[PDB]
Amino acid sequence: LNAEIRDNVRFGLEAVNANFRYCF
Amino acid sequence: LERVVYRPDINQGNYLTANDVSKIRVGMTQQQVAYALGTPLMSDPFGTNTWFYVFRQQPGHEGVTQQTLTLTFNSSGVLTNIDNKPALS
Amino acid sequence: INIVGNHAFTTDELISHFQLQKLAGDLETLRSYYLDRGYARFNIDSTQVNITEGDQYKLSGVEVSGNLAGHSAEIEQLTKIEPGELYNGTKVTKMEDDIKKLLGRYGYAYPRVQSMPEINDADKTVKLRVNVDAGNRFYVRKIRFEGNDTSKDAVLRREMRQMEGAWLGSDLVDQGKERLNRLGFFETVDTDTQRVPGSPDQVDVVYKVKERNTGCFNFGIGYGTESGVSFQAGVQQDNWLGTGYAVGINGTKNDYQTYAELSVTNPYFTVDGVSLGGRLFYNDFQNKSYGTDVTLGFPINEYNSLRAGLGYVHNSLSNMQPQVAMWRYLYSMGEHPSTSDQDNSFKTDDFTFNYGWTYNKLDRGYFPTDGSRVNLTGKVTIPGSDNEYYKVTLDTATYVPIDDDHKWVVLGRTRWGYGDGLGGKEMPFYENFYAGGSSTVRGFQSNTIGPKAVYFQASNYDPYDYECATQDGAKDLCKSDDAVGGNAMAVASLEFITPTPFISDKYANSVRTSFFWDMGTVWDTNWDSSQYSGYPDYSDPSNIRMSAGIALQWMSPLGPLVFSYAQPFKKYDGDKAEQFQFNIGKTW
Amino acid sequence: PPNEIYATAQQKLQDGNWRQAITQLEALDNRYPFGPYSQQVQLDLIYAYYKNADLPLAQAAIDRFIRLNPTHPNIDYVMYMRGLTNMALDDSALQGFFGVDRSDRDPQHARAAFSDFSKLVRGYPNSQYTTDATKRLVFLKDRLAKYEYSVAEYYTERGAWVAVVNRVEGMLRDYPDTQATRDALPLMENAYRQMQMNAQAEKVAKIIAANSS
Amino acid sequence: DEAYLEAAPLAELHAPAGMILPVTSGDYAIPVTNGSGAVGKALDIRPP
């Protein structure tokens, strides 16, 4: 339902509430 | 408008004082001059043998003060001419 | 092992500094203590702790000789000690270090300073002879940076006070170090001064920096078959692509509210530090408003700066509720709404001017340990506006360290503000101050501190709302919990920063912990307590809310997060408590 | 058995998920660290790490290999990989995407890459990779000249005229053949005029005319 | 990327008659080669 690819690269979905964050 | 904007003081070139400037004499070697005054920071690389000593200061919200000393040396490393310009035109 | 042979002082005065290579350190500490107490002949014969004590010696004066290239008065002042003071090895070391620093101030990067006290035993006195060799002046040939793989070189070279081709000043390099720390773009900054292999009088300066990741721009959409589609997104950045420009663009779109904001600024428009920037916004909540502003500012000294700017906002309201404070305002504006009649509208075009003043002498970007900051912001209306008013907000914070390792620190955080109308007119109610929440006073629900609306007949929601909202029952004045904000505020918090003995090394520079006590209040003016004598008097500023608690701040990989818990001690009727709070900070 | 692991690693290197090739190669090092083909595995790990941009591992693997094989029939391959590995650090996907000029960032990685390519070109003049290494050397040299140019412009704007003259002279000594050096000449002409040193301004103007188009 | 293949050509400077240009260092010197071989995407960079 949720996973991260790298530090400070986060995506979630979980009806649903899609959200994404990415740091520079 | 710029007259009220903060400006840090800026210094450029080697430090000079009359007590040391007065010590340079024609016939002195380059090593003695460098010892007495310090390593030159500017030189003319274009096929000549001369040193430039530039004492430049600009306080914030102040004009520019500069003393320029040019030392001409022969191919043997002996000083041949002293060009002392105490102030800018 | 114990302390044996002390007669000038008992062992209870000495063992308090002992841990009884720890012993070698304790013995050196005791020897330094005695040397600093005039015992020129104090020493340790053996460890078993067999001590040999001397007498107390007093300084007769200090003589200095050597290659002192001028500045003799400054050296004399540094070494001038009034007669009769006890011999002190620490004072001697301090004098030598002050001489070295003074010489560094003028380019004597590598002086040789040594001293030798003459101990007079026939008469208990010490005469000190200091041998100083200033050495040669040093020049900086190149200034290089390493580790800045993202930010442009142009940024690191402007936060500098040491130029190439000029004499070295140690303080002029350290100022660069502090300014870089003040930039807020780096995890750590350090320095080196490596001598140039080709000449005894030239040195290079190298800075080591490590950039932290910033921005973390987010977005997302809530969705369901009952909730529909709710979109929210935005990007924030302090150092966009490494150019030094700050960017903030955010917005949302849903079935009840839509808004956006853009703010962009250049801290260095000109080479000497003049900054420019501005913002645009729109927010339509189902009332709407929109507008823009542009601000220019510049430094006036090393620590102070000024800002000023102009802008315009449009405000349009409709379906306003019959509130006493709102109607007071509307009547002051010449409006004559029908009693408890929801059918109304009001819109104005307000052209304003804003300005401010700051001071910042903090040592760190995000976790300051010393210094203080002051931020005074004023706002005034100009001719042509419908709403004539002014506002002032003052925000200050001071850090004072207790611990030498800066683990124990006390923070004073205060905010005050006010504002009023011009020409006998009132302040718009949508500009009122609110307090409560993690940004001001912890432990209370956001914007719940302050006076509340009193409600007084037609509405399109009549049957569903509370009895004083429904126009079939709303026959009289009713008290409510609907905060309307005020025209004056004050907030203060005392926070103690402590060590974090419960965290691992990976958090050593990322977690700060503190204890705090918060207080604050919001109140109004122009409150007719006679006409509304059946309700509390909102002009009384003494109803100050108070709470205290514990908080932790963590500079997580995703930015500054704040977790806190606090409980109230002083509460007034109408307040609502909230004991556990968490927010993304991106401030302070 | 090692033959199936080697075959799998080769299939994953030819196409597909290079991380699986990494897994197979690590399995080979864990199970057969001293086998007759362990050198092949070490080279395959270096290549695969490069392909996946696992640059700290490619570098560690290379330094290990060199210590392990001071001399080798294909040591020039390893040095070539060193040059590519160092060049791979001087980049940013976001800076490329947005058209950012990377020449103003820390050039130390470029210096290391230059040094290794020079060593390779001088030591193995008949290597099949010589042409690419020389083209890379020209590119890197131009990048370093650009770095110096940008620094000189900053100090020119600040009026640190002695730093401008000294740094440009340095450029003349270190990068005598590059467009950046020709473009910098008016900076010296200006610096020698803000300070009354007209003989040098004249010399600079003369070299400009002599080398102008 | 392969943008390095588009790098501008090099060209030396000439002195004005009667002038001597600064003496250069031997560092960063590029040797003269024949230039034979594949470049860029045309190279096989797999292990031997």
Shape field of chain A: elongated
The portion of residues assigned to helices of chain D is over 70%
Radius of gyration of chain A: 9 Å
- What oligomeric state best describes the polypeptide chains here? heteropentamer
Class of chain D, according to the CATH hierarchy?
Mainly Alpha
Instruction: Strand order, main sheet of chain A: write it out.
Output: 1-2-3
Q: Main β-sheet of chain A: number of strands, strand sense, barrel status?
A: 3 strands, antiparallel
Protein name (chain E): Outer membrane protein assembly factor BamC
Family (chain E): Belongs to the BamC family.
Subcellular location (chain E): Cell outer membrane
Organism (chain E): Escherichia coli
Describe what is shown at a glance:
Chain B has 89 residues and is an alpha+beta fold. In chain B, 13% of the residues lie in helices and 34% in strands.
Question: How is this structure best described in words?
Answer:
The complex is a heteropentamer of chains A (24), B (89), C (588), D (213) and E (48). With 89 residues, chain B is α+β, with helices and mostly antiparallel strands. Chain B has a single domain (10-85), classed as Beta-lactamase Inhibitory Protein, Chain:B, domain 1 (2-Layer Sandwich), CATH 3.30.1450. Chain B has helices at 18-21, 30-37, and strands spanning 10-12, 42-43, 50-58, 65-73, 79-85. In chain B, strand 3 and strand 4 (65-73) form a beta hairpin. Chain C has a domain at 1-52: membrane protein fhac (Ubiquitin-like (UB roll)). Chain C contains 6 helices and 26 strands. A 16-stranded antiparallel sheet of chain C has the order 9-10-11-12-13-14-15-16-17-18-19-22-23-24-25-26, with no helix packed on it. Chain C has a 3-stranded mixed sheet with strand order 3-5-4, with helices on one face. In chain C, strands 6-8-7 form a 3-stranded mixed sheet, with helices on one face. In chain C, a hairpin with an 8-residue loop joins strand 10 (228-237) and strand 11 (246-253). The longest helix of chain C is centred in the first third of the chain and has 17 residues, at 89-105. Chain D is mostly helical and 213 residues long. Chain E is low in regular secondary structure and 48 residues long. Chain E has no helices and no strands. Chain E is elongated. Chains in contact: A-C, B-C, B-D, B-E, C-D, D-E. The D-E interface holds D 13, 40, 43-44, 46-47, 74, 77, 80-81, 84, 96, 114, 118, 121-122, 125, 128-132, 134-139, 141-142, 144, 169, 172-179, 181-182, 203, 206-207, 209-211 and E 1, 4-5, 7-8, 10-16, 19, 21-25, 27-28, 30-31, 33, 35-40, 43, 45-48. Strand 3 of chain A pairs antiparallel with strand 9 (218-224) of chain C, so a sheet runs across the interface. The PDB classes it as membrane protein. Keywords: membrane protein folding, outer membrane protein, BAM, membrane protein.
